[PDB]
């Protein structure tokens with residue numbers, strides 16, 4: 608039998624305002640959730656999530672095999688050596704059900720000095736033909752900034768929750784250099800569903816994606832209304848209930864590092880479910896040179912022995928490690 612994780616719904620709307628005590632009350636809820644299961648739902652967040660899942664649906668359903676090759680990351684197309692992160696992630700019928708499209712900071716253009724320098728993890732987004740997918744790129748880029756604004760506010764809540772000034776994290780989260788990504792993931796309904804696309808967990812649960820910690824500072828996730836996620840606790844995995852109006856929030860391993868594991872990166876996995884559904888994560892990454900000094904909120908002096916980590920190197924290592932452990936997505 609499988610229990611259900613406590614995932615509180617936190618009204619985050621005070622984090623956009625100037626009622627400082629109300630923000631502390633939000634911060635307390637984020638603190639409590641971060642110390643319990645590690646997940647909470649952000650509600651009253653101001654993003655039109657209906658248009659998000661609509662625009663995403665028409666894209667996945669109308670893109671053709673030719674277009675998928677044209678946009679494919681180098682794991683699927685050797686011609687595209689510059690596309691490590693951004694581009695299309697093809698399904699492999701009979702073998703791999705999931706497919707996705709990942710894009711990065713729209714300000715990453717040929718003019719950007721990180722592109723000029725060819726710094727790892729920086730890429731120029733690739734987009735389908737505007738006439739074949741009208742309004743898609745416009746919707747996608749605006750969504751990047753809509754969720755960017757939400758994440759900035761959420762980061763002020765985390766900062767206050769940890770006893771810091773509200774810009775402790777957000778100061779490093781900037782439109783000019785953020786390494787944050789959006790991934791538009793389609794999980795298809797398949798009949799018959801290929802067993803090769805299903806992994807079996809140690810406890811016997813059938814999975815689409817194995818246990819992992821997120822490579823992020825925090826992750827800001829919209830999913831359609833199909834229950835699939837599980838979070839690991841000391842008593843085993845617990846089901847995370849769906850909510851296709853809220854944003855599911857969790858800390859990534861960079862937060863665990865800088866808080867001396869005070870806010871853990873929750874380990875979670877994706878159950879196999881034979882249902883058409885969407886998963887649209889926004890991975891909140893900082894800039895390539897961003898460094899946050901670790902601290903320990905458990906200690907009176909707040910001192911940590913842990914080494915400061917540059918975020919770019921953390922991200923480069925983390926992305927490659929997740930691929931090796933859980934397979935090329």
Ligand SMILES: CC1(C)S[C@@H]2[C@H](NC(=O)CCC[C@H](N)C(=O)O)C(=O)N2[C@H]1C(=O)O
Pocket residue numbers: 692693709787788790792816828877886888890926929936
């Ligand atoms: C559980 C998740 C939201 S998180 C997990 C898994 N995560 C990743 O692959 C990291 C993607 C990083 C991205 N390409 C980039 O360059 O920034 C994924 O996809 N999974 C999702 C899923 O399967 O729903």
Ligand SMILES: [Fe+3]
Pocket residue numbers: 819820821875
């Ligand atoms: Fe995850």
